[PDB]
Amino acid sequence: DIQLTQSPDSLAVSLGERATINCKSSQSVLYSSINKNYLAWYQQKPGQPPKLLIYWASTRESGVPDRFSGSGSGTDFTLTISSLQAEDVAVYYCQQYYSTPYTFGQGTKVEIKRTVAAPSVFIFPPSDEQLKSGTASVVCLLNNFYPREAKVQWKVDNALQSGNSQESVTEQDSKDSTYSLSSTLTLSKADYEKHKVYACEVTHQGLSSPVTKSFNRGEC
Amino acid sequence: EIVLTQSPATLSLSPGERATLSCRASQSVSSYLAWYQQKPGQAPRLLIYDASNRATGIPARFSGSGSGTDFTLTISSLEPEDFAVYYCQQRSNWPPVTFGGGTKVEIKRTVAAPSVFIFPPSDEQLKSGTASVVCLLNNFYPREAKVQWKVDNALQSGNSQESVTEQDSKDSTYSLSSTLTLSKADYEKHKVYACEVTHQGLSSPVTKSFNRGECS
Amino acid sequence: QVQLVQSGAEVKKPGASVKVSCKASGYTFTGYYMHWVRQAPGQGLEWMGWINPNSGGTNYAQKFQGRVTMTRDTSISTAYMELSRLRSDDTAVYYCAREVMVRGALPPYGMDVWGQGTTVTVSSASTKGPSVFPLAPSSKSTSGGTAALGCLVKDYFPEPVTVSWNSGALTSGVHTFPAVLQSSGLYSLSSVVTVPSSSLGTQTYICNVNHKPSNTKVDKKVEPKSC
Amino acid sequence: QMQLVQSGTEVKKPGESLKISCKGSGYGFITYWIGWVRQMPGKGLEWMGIIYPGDSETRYSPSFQGQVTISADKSINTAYLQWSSLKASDTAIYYCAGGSGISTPMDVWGQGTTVTVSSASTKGPSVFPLAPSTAALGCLVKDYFPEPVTVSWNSGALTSGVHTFPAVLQSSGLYSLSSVVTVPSSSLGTQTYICNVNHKPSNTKVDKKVEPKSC
Amino acid sequence: NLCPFGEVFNATRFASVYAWNRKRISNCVADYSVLYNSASFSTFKCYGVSPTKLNDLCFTNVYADSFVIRGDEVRQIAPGQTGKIADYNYKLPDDFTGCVIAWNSNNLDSKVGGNYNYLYRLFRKSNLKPFERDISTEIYQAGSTPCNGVEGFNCYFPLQSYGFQPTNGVGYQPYRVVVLSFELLHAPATVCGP
Ligand SMILES: *[C@@H]1O[C@H](CO)[C@@H](O)[C@H](O)[C@H]1NC(C)=O
Predict the structure, then answer these.
(1) Taking Cα atoms as reference points, which of D155, D152, D160 lies closest to residue A175?
(2) Which of E 130-149 lie inside 8 A of C, CB atoms?
(3) Does residue E145 share a domain with residue E67?
(4) What is the Å distance from ligand 1's center to D77 Cα?
(5) Domain residue spans in chain C?
(6) Rounded CA separation E27/E163 (Å)
(7) Which CATH number applies to D126-210?
(8) How far apart are CA D109 and CA E37, in angstroms?
(9) Can you tell me which atom of ligand 1 is nearest the CA of E8?
């Protein structure tokens, strides 16, 4: 089977700038019959099915903007987005259709790059309502930040927590191209009422030093 | 040579009856099965080719089918002209042409016992050194009949010949003649000459006898 | 339309050869195989071989490979079958039959047109007229009974003999049996007729036997027995 | 010119059979080979197999051969993807794609069929306040099955600054979610903030008012 | 100057598969829509090329091979297939680029009493090479004795006729097949779209 690999895995580039994605083939996909490379490029936006952008390595599908260009041959191929637009934020896949079984690249995520923005950090203790079901949910919210990479460390009486936290992230916002993130620490009420200080420590590029948001159980 | 098994040997049916004839074809990589009809004194005539297709000028009552090695010729309703002999033929590589043994389709009718007569040798043949004793079975059905010659109560073997006519135009019966031939000396060495007939229409075998020298 | 006409009957000796012709008309001669098929008296059909009239090539049956020769004259559209070293069991009717040729494939349409056949009799016997003997009606009579009488036509060659009764004026109840071949090589036949016992005194019954190959004509009156 | 339409969302139990469909419409469908692509949550595309509906010539990838069955009813221009006994690992989106010929690209795609195989049964969410004390407030929509859940604010009258996070599959086999909004802290005393949550599979509609908590 | 695809698809008479016909198409403009937007076809299998895009392409030559087979053998007209048709009559290469179009022709190529004019090769000494045509009519020698040009023991007619009857099942009915191959040589392209 023909193996495809893409590079990079993630790509952040500013509005109107250039984006490059490389597809490597473990085997030649060139048919010397008609002298064509049987390689295609697809784009998939969130919640959308994939969409065919380029076929035969370099031929644009009808209705695809010229700013998408396919190049290469043999085992080395390249998709170039000259002048990245907001519409083009998506995951891109190379695929070979030289021979069945068809195979895909692992996909390359392409997002808008913007200036550094530190997050707004908020912390939410578990409601008494939820407490009366037998579980405590502590929430940490990071609002409107960039880049997406950040660290969120939960600490309970200055003890670091592990394997008891879930992270969720929004897509790049339409307007300001920022992200927001929620980290939820879930535990039994029995093991929530055992400690006092609950703290969420956020490390981000936009902060000169990590921001800690905390609250004490039993106190407001 | 190889002969295709046709079944049955004889089909006795009434006019207007349905006729079903079977031919077992030999094993072949590829072959074509045909059916032919033959009337007395005439060449065979193609009825069916490739097991299922009527030849040119063949009436709609003739049809054919084939499954595996078993092929069937069907006549939906027998006409008077349909009573004849029928041969399956197989066209192949080895042998290039093979014929079946033939199925005779005869007219079935009510059983009729034969009228049995015996004729001693004439004086004019005895004046020539040979004796011919004739036994006539007249107007019988069905065709199966056993005729046995007895000289002084001794069953004869290998000295008689049989002749049968075709089914009669009018009453659809058969007639048979069995002729026993001996030297004049052997004729004169014996007394009792008997023709013994076994037929389905006879409750018991009928014997017609004469002594040498007797008038009738 | 399509027609196959064969040559006339032949009588040969048990060492000679026979050559039967078969003239084709109404179609393109070179398009169809010409097969030969023979039928012995009272027997079935046996394939002898085929000839390609276009190329002249032949394919002979196993039984006759070595003493059968099939030829053709395309200019007159005639096929020929020669059988050599004849035996008495070669006596039979011989038919030509056409079968369409398909280059490289088995023909599907069968043998759709046959010739009328050619009787070939192989025997060491020579032409001989028959002896006619009476089969006299029984001298014992009942008032309603039926009597049988006839003529034994013995020791003739070759076939056929024609038998009539009262110069063709007596047909009802007449049975002329098929000839049988005797061990001597000569043919024998019997013709019988059933009549009223009553009629024996008043009606003359005469069998008319004709054997044209020997020019033998015998009108024998079969009489009631003088007891 | 050619369009593929797939059957609707499926929520099944482990061990159950399933058969999803993809119907073609438009000119030139006679030339189209229909393939099946799997995309597990947050992962890439996996080509499962392909079928030509005209003669049901079927090709599988070695990783899905014998695990699924791809077939087709050409009388209704439909291709089928079926399992005899579902596993939890089968939970994913399944796309039908079309290409006019073998060794051709997939130029036509279906909208996708979401399949969820889980031990869990239908259950409606518990909605809890994330109370403020600019400030942030929100609603924690916990312990529901299956997806999806719709969350609005003031019945669609409040949209600016709202972030509804994607559901996470919790320990419990039930999903949980949060919807937050940034507000002026002036708001808190007099303005009313209502998260409207709808979980249609359970027929649940919970509208909750989030206010600052009293001590 | 449209390409004469009508005279190929709408030909009154088709060839036997053993003697499959070939029409070379050159120096012509083609409208492949009329083919892939038709509703008259039962099979339309393309390999390495999209018919929906054939009007955007150019080619040195297009070869149109046409013949008649029975329905259950249409599957054999494809790269990598085996069987009597693929081994002995019409063989496609592995790198085949083109389309295989077939439609039921029972109303044209079957008749009462059987149509025996369509033949296929039953025996051969070896498998055909890609696009090889064999019109040999020599008796096939399956044993040790030469056949001397006649059928007999271990010697068979090479060709076999189709028994096309209107009552045949659909898998045994006649199907007309057209195979389009697209040829790109290092040369000017003369078959193009509108
Ligand atoms: C064959 O004839 C039909 C009807 O006359 C026509 O619609 C079709 O376009 C023709 N085929 C080609 C290839 O021109």
Answers:
(1) D160
(2) 136-138, 149
(3) no
(4) 24
(5) 3-122, 131-222
(6) 40
(7) 2.60.40.10
(8) 20
(9) 13
